[PDB]
Design a protein around this motif. Sequence first.
Motif, PDB file in Angstrom:
ATOM      1  N   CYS A  43       0.756  -1.208  -0.093  1.00 57.88           N
ATOM      2  CA  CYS A  43       0.017  -0.033   0.108  1.00 57.88           C
ATOM      3  C   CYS A  43       0.872   1.264   0.021  1.00 57.88           C
ATOM      4  O   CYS A  43       1.807   1.467   0.785  1.00 57.88           O
ATOM      5  N   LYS A  44       0.549   2.175  -0.781  1.00 54.94           N
ATOM      6  CA  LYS A  44       1.225   3.254  -0.907  1.00 54.94           C
ATOM      7  C   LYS A  44       0.426   4.561  -1.619  1.00 54.94           C
ATOM      8  O   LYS A  44      -0.381   4.273  -2.321  1.00 54.94           O
ATOM      9  N   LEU A  45       0.636   5.746  -1.146  1.00 53.94           N
ATOM     10  CA  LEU A  45      -0.130   6.877  -1.833  1.00 53.94           C
ATOM     11  C   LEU A  45       0.518   7.277  -2.921  1.00 53.94           C
ATOM     12  O   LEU A  45       1.523   6.829  -3.561  1.00 53.94           O
ATOM     13  N   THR A  46      -0.424   7.758  -3.680  1.00 52.15           N
ATOM     14  CA  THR A  46      -0.177   8.194  -5.315  1.00 52.15           C
ATOM     15  C   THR A  46       0.035   9.611  -5.642  1.00 52.15           C
ATOM     16  O   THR A  46       0.417  10.115  -6.804  1.00 52.15           O
ATOM     17  N   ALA A  47      -0.243  10.341  -4.644  1.00 56.20           N
ATOM     18  CA  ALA A  47      -0.406  11.879  -5.018  1.00 56.20           C
ATOM     19  C   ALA A  47       0.031  12.769  -3.540  1.00 56.20           C
ATOM     20  O   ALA A  47       0.054  12.187  -2.704  1.00 56.20           O
ATOM     21  N   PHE A  48       0.481  14.100  -3.857  1.00 59.54           N
ATOM     22  CA  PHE A  48       0.934  14.960  -2.749  1.00 59.54           C
ATOM     23  C   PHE A  48       0.748  16.124  -3.238  1.00 59.54           C
ATOM     24  O   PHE A  48       0.544  16.769  -4.235  1.00 59.54           O
ATOM     25  N   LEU A  49       0.440  17.015  -2.233  1.00 63.12           N
ATOM     26  CA  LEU A  49       0.265  18.658  -2.412  1.00 63.12           C
ATOM     27  C   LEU A  49       1.578  19.373  -2.103  1.00 63.12           C
ATOM     28  O   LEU A  49       2.121  19.034  -0.984  1.00 63.12           O
ATOM     29  N   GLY A  50       1.759  20.456  -2.863  1.00 60.51           N
ATOM     30  CA  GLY A  50       2.781  21.123  -2.720  1.00 60.51           C
ATOM     31  C   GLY A  50       2.790  22.709  -2.922  1.00 60.51           C
ATOM     32  O   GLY A  50       1.585  23.100  -3.590  1.00 60.51           O
ATOM     33  N   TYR A  51       3.661  23.503  -2.888  1.00 59.33           N
ATOM     34  CA  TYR A  51       3.558  24.802  -3.149  1.00 59.33           C
ATOM     35  C   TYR A  51       4.648  25.174  -3.904  1.00 59.33           C
ATOM     36  O   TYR A  51       5.739  25.027  -3.505  1.00 59.33           O
ATOM     37  N   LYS A  52       4.527  26.140  -5.097  1.00 61.20           N
ATOM     38  CA  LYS A  52       5.491  26.528  -5.629  1.00 61.20           C
ATOM     39  C   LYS A  52       6.235  27.717  -4.915  1.00 61.20           C
ATOM     40  O   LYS A  52       5.585  28.748  -5.134  1.00 61.20           O
ATOM     41  N   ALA A  53       7.681  27.452  -4.932  1.00 65.23           N
ATOM     42  CA  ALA A  53       8.418  28.582  -4.239  1.00 65.23           C
ATOM     43  C   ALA A  53       8.935  29.565  -4.938  1.00 65.23           C
ATOM     44  O   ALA A  53       8.953  30.712  -4.907  1.00 65.23           O
ATOM     45  N   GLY A  54       9.626  28.805  -5.883  1.00 64.56           N
ATOM     46  CA  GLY A  54      10.336  29.561  -7.050  1.00 64.56           C
ATOM     47  C   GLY A  54      11.376  28.957  -7.924  1.00 64.56           C
ATOM     48  O   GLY A  54      11.163  27.526  -7.754  1.00 64.56           O
ATOM     49  N   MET A  55      12.176  29.377  -8.808  1.00 64.62           N
ATOM     50  CA  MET A  55      12.959  28.734  -9.586  1.00 64.62           C
ATOM     51  C   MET A  55      14.513  29.210  -9.252  1.00 64.62           C
ATOM     52  O   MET A  55      14.830  30.351  -8.814  1.00 64.62           O
ATOM     53  N   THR A  56      15.383  28.157  -9.755  1.00 67.79           N
ATOM     54  CA  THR A  56      16.899  28.497  -9.738  1.00 67.79           C
ATOM     55  C   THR A  56      17.501  27.520 -10.628  1.00 67.79           C
ATOM     56  O   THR A  56      16.747  26.788 -11.257  1.00 67.79           O
ATOM     57  N   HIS A  57      18.800  27.757 -10.950  1.00 70.34           N
ATOM     58  CA  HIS A  57      19.494  26.974 -11.794  1.00 70.34           C
ATOM     59  C   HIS A  57      20.560  26.043 -11.092  1.00 70.34           C
ATOM     60  O   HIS A  57      20.958  26.418  -9.976  1.00 70.34           O
ATOM     61  N   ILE A  58      20.770  24.879 -11.591  1.00 68.89           N
ATOM     62  CA  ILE A  58      22.041  23.973 -11.055  1.00 68.89           C
ATOM     63  C   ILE A  58      22.925  23.625 -12.243  1.00 68.89           C
ATOM     64  O   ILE A  58      22.536  23.531 -13.399  1.00 68.89           O
ATOM     65  N   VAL A  59      23.826  23.039 -11.782  1.00 69.01           N
ATOM     66  CA  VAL A  59      24.946  22.542 -12.681  1.00 69.01           C
ATOM     67  C   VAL A  59      25.357  21.216 -12.362  1.00 69.01           C
ATOM     68  O   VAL A  59      25.582  20.745 -11.219  1.00 69.01           O
ATOM     69  N   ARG A  60      25.198  20.277 -13.287  1.00 70.84           N
ATOM     70  CA  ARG A  60      25.423  18.897 -13.167  1.00 70.84           C
ATOM     71  C   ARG A  60      26.465  18.249 -14.139  1.00 70.84           C
ATOM     72  O   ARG A  60      26.450  18.897 -15.403  1.00 70.84           O
ATOM     73  N   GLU A  61      27.301  17.185 -13.827  1.00 72.54           N
ATOM     74  CA  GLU A  61      28.201  16.467 -15.073  1.00 72.54           C
ATOM     75  C   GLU A  61      27.139  15.426 -15.469  1.00 72.54           C
ATOM     76  O   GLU A  61      26.621  14.405 -14.644  1.00 72.54           O
ATOM     77  N   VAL A  62      26.709  15.392 -16.746  1.00 70.60           N
ATOM     78  CA  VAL A  62      26.161  14.577 -17.502  1.00 70.60           C
ATOM     79  C   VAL A  62      26.699  13.462 -17.875  1.00 70.60           C
ATOM     80  O   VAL A  62      28.038  13.115 -17.975  1.00 70.60           O
ATOM     81  N   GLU A  63      26.001  11.948 -17.673  1.00 73.24           N
ATOM     82  CA  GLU A  63      26.428  10.873 -17.958  1.00 73.24           C
ATOM     83  C   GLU A  63      25.426  10.191 -19.062  1.00 73.24           C
ATOM     84  O   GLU A  63      24.521   9.439 -18.601  1.00 73.24           O
ATOM     85  N   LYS A  64      25.703  10.468 -20.056  1.00 73.97           N
ATOM     86  CA  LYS A  64      24.814  10.047 -21.343  1.00 73.97           C
ATOM     87  C   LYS A  64      25.876   9.553 -22.373  1.00 73.97           C
ATOM     88  O   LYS A  64      26.278  10.225 -23.423  1.00 73.97           O
ATOM     89  N   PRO A  65      26.133   8.230 -22.659  1.00 77.24           N
ATOM     90  CA  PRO A  65      27.008   7.543 -23.453  1.00 77.24           C
ATOM     91  C   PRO A  65      26.241   7.821 -24.767  1.00 77.24           C
ATOM     92  O   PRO A  65      25.054   7.685 -25.066  1.00 77.24           O
ATOM     93  N   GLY A  66      27.368   8.270 -25.693  1.00 73.98           N
ATOM     94  CA  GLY A  66      26.707   8.511 -26.997  1.00 73.98           C
ATOM     95  C   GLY A  66      26.427   9.861 -27.346  1.00 73.98           C
ATOM     96  O   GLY A  66      25.853  10.589 -28.509  1.00 73.98           O
ATOM     97  N   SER A  67      26.451  10.942 -26.138  1.00 71.82           N
ATOM     98  CA  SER A  67      25.853  12.083 -26.358  1.00 71.82           C
ATOM     99  C   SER A  67      27.048  13.157 -26.259  1.00 71.82           C
ATOM    100  O   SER A  67      28.154  12.892 -25.860  1.00 71.82           O
ATOM    101  N   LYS A  68      26.690  14.349 -26.880  1.00 69.73           N
ATOM    102  CA  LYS A  68      27.752  15.489 -27.076  1.00 69.73           C
ATOM    103  C   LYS A  68      28.092  15.694 -25.612  1.00 69.73           C
ATOM    104  O   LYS A  68      29.200  16.367 -25.086  1.00 69.73           O
TER     105      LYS A  68
END
Lengths: 386, 110
Positions: free
Chosen positions: A40-65
């Motif tokens: 048994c597990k819930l399927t949905a949840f409520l939240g509130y939109k706080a804002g936006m920002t940007h992140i930087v990450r190292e991609v791991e996508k074989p065959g991608s530029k």
Amino acid sequence: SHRKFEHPRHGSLGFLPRKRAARHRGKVKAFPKDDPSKPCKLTAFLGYKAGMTHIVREVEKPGSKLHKKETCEAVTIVETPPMVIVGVVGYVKTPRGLRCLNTVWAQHLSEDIKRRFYKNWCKSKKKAFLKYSKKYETDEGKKDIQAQLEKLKKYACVIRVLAHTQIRKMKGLKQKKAHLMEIQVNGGSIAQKVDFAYGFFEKQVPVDAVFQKDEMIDIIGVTKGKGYEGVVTRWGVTRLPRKTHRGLRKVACIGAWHPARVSFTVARAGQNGYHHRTEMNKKVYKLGKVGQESHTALTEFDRTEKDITPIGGFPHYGVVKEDYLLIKGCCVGTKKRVVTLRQSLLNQTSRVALEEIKLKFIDTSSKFGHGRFQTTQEKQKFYGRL
Amino acid sequence: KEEVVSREYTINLHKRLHGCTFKKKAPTAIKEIRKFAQKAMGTKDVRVDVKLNKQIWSRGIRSVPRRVRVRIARKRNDDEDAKEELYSLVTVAEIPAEGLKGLGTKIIED
RNA sequence: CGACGGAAGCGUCGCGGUGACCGCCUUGAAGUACAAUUUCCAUCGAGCGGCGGGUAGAAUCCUUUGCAGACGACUUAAACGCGACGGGGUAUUGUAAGUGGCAGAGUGGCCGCCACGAUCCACUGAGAUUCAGCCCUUUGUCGCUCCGAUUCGU
RNA sequence: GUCUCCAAGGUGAACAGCCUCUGGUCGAUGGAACAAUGUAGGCAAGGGAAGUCGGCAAAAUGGAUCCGUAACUUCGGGAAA
RNA sequence: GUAGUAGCAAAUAUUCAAAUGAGAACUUUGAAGGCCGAAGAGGGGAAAGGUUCCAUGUGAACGGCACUUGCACAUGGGUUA
Ligand SMILES: [K+]
Ligand SMILES: [K+]
Ligand SMILES: [K+]
Ligand SMILES: [K+]
Ligand SMILES: [K+]
Ligand SMILES: [K+]
Ligand SMILES: [K+]
Ligand SMILES: [K+]
Ligand SMILES: [K+]
Ligand SMILES: [Mg+2]
Ligand SMILES: [Mg+2]
Ligand SMILES: [Mg+2]
Ligand SMILES: [Mg+2]
Ligand SMILES: [Mg+2]
Ligand SMILES: [Mg+2]
Ligand SMILES: [Mg+2]
Ligand SMILES: [Mg+2]
Ligand SMILES: [Mg+2]
Ligand SMILES: [Mg+2]
Ligand SMILES: [Mg+2]
Ligand SMILES: [Mg+2]
Ligand SMILES: [Mg+2]
Ligand SMILES: [Mg+2]
Ligand SMILES: [Mg+2]
Ligand SMILES: [Mg+2]
Ligand SMILES: [Mg+2]
Ligand SMILES: [Mg+2]
Ligand SMILES: [Mg+2]
Ligand SMILES: [Mg+2]
Ligand SMILES: [Mg+2]
Ligand SMILES: [Mg+2]
Ligand SMILES: [Mg+2]
Ligand SMILES: [Mg+2]
Ligand SMILES: [Mg+2]
Ligand SMILES: [Mg+2]
Ligand SMILES: [Mg+2]
Ligand SMILES: [Mg+2]
């Protein structure tokens, strides 16, 4: 005669009418298919939109530029404090669809949820659920409550829990009336679902119990409102020449002579925005649990001690102190708008869905300008403590 | 509490007149001050001293002062069959040497 | 009362109580004069006068908010929080006014001093502005916490 | 629409435009909001007439000082080339 | 019927206090903020008008909102070679 040249029509006829949504809280039109073999597990949840920002990450996508390279991508912060279960509802499968059989509520209901039942809470006598709560105080009443639960176990085919948000914990929202919704329970037998639901009465369900990191979710809500709007902005029709008498922000021909009527497929001015929308495949980059390092904006590469909230606070929202989700891309609605998170209805098998996210940097500079300081201490040290 | 009371307020006209049309900016400042007195004193009848009106219009119809320090004195009207028992008189107030820094609402004594 | 029935269960069944029919007995029918709807049922709905039990709220206007908006509508708020100042955070511009200078192209008087001088330097990443739809908030100051109005019943 | 007289200061070539003094005047029904469409006025990344019957509209040029100025020409001009 | 609808939008602009009045965003006084900017929204006259001139007063109508107001209405006065 045939149109001289061919181009696709402007706008989608699948999002009609373009009227104001009849609700403010995002409604779940369809829940994930139920698999009895799973817990048994819930399927949905409520939240509130706080804002936006940007992140930087190292991609791991074989065959991608971008393989083994860094990419900067926008993310949305959704503050998701734990929800409180206050009731359970069961539905029976009938030839006329699902019919609500009965609703069982918890003995104790918070003031925040009780406000949802009134248009003027302060002026009222606050009698809601007072008589209902009394039958929990008598042995005969307790037997009746248990009898109703057994009735759901016998006839119900779909079980949903009544859950509300703890909106008081986010003072920035300036709202005391909590949001209530039905969240379907998937997994296990009907009896387990009822026992699962009744066990959580008056208890808190954290967002981690529903969603996790690196999974795809659907976000439901009402878009930003924009009022009366013309066809050019509303539907995307091209502007007319500069020398047009009586204006150029119009559709020139709204129909042939026959049929002698304006069709519903012609662009017309009217309400723009504040429409109900369901957007799919939003990946969860980060789940912040209060009291843990996951709640801070630290990364394995950036060890600067700082919180998720940018200096000066999230504009028009405030400071995020509860559990939150970092979601790739953009979210429907304005700041502070309640949004509904739903588990994906599809089987996530694409490489993007299964990609393991590893954030390198989370930007916390001020979003009320061209922010260049990640922390207040950094700014103070820059100006010699100012 | 007491019908006759005087206080000194700092009204933030800048945010109240934000985005206002130039030809109506100073006239709108008079209305905003009149509304401010009504909320702060609860008296519909508000009278603006000519000196305060002069200060509002000192820099023309566009550039109203960002913040103004005023004295609001609620007092009884003693005219035959006055429409309202009380009324508020808004007049100019002196600004200390340090200016409007750290200056809150102050009650004026007798 | 008990059990069962959830597809719209509103019904079925069992036990107990009670009436009618039937059984037995008694008595009457007409002159309603040759037919004139064979008025009388249950389906709710009730409207009233009494006899018992039960219950002791909301919505809307006015105000507020801007996640909304042509106007309506919509999302908020209404004894504690709210509101008005102020402070801090954040941001924009680019270093305020005043004071001082053995800085300053030079020039005019006096016997180095005096006067004129755009500009420059120090105090000064200073000053100004910063929600009006930004964030936090008594270190601190002040006010208000509700006069009302319109309706709604199985 | 309708003849004519008097005509200050500053900027500047200038009874140009812009501001001011004498004199005159706030006379154009007001209030609250700030949607679409409109009218009037603007601006815009990169491209630069690909738009359109057509560069329509707009933009660009613009004062003064010095230098320099072709074809052609009726010898004067062209030329502020 | 349309319909309390189309519509009142050029000529930069009004604000405060007091007086008067049954009634004042519109009358008058004072203060402030603007405009015409001497080829004027200033000061005269020729045509044309004919009492519109001045004082006092005012029920209605009229001045396309309003008016205590007036180039309206009523009474009286006024043009000297
Ligand atoms: K055609
Ligand atoms: K778009
Ligand atoms: K076009
Ligand atoms: K300085
Ligand atoms: K400096
Ligand atoms: K418009
Ligand atoms: K072209
Ligand atoms: K004449
Ligand atoms: K003569
Ligand atoms: Mg075709
Ligand atoms: Mg559906
Ligand atoms: Mg909007
Ligand atoms: Mg045309
Ligand atoms: Mg920003
Ligand atoms: Mg502040
Ligand atoms: Mg606000
Ligand atoms: Mg000159
Ligand atoms: Mg001139
Ligand atoms: Mg461009
Ligand atoms: Mg460019
Ligand atoms: Mg080019
Ligand atoms: Mg072409
Ligand atoms: Mg073409
Ligand atoms: Mg062609
Ligand atoms: Mg042209
Ligand atoms: Mg040539
Ligand atoms: Mg109209
Ligand atoms: Mg018009
Ligand atoms: Mg208007
Ligand atoms: Mg005008
Ligand atoms: Mg006027
Ligand atoms: Mg002019
Ligand atoms: Mg002028
Ligand atoms: Mg002349
Ligand atoms: Mg009239
Ligand atoms: Mg006259
Ligand atoms: Mg007359």
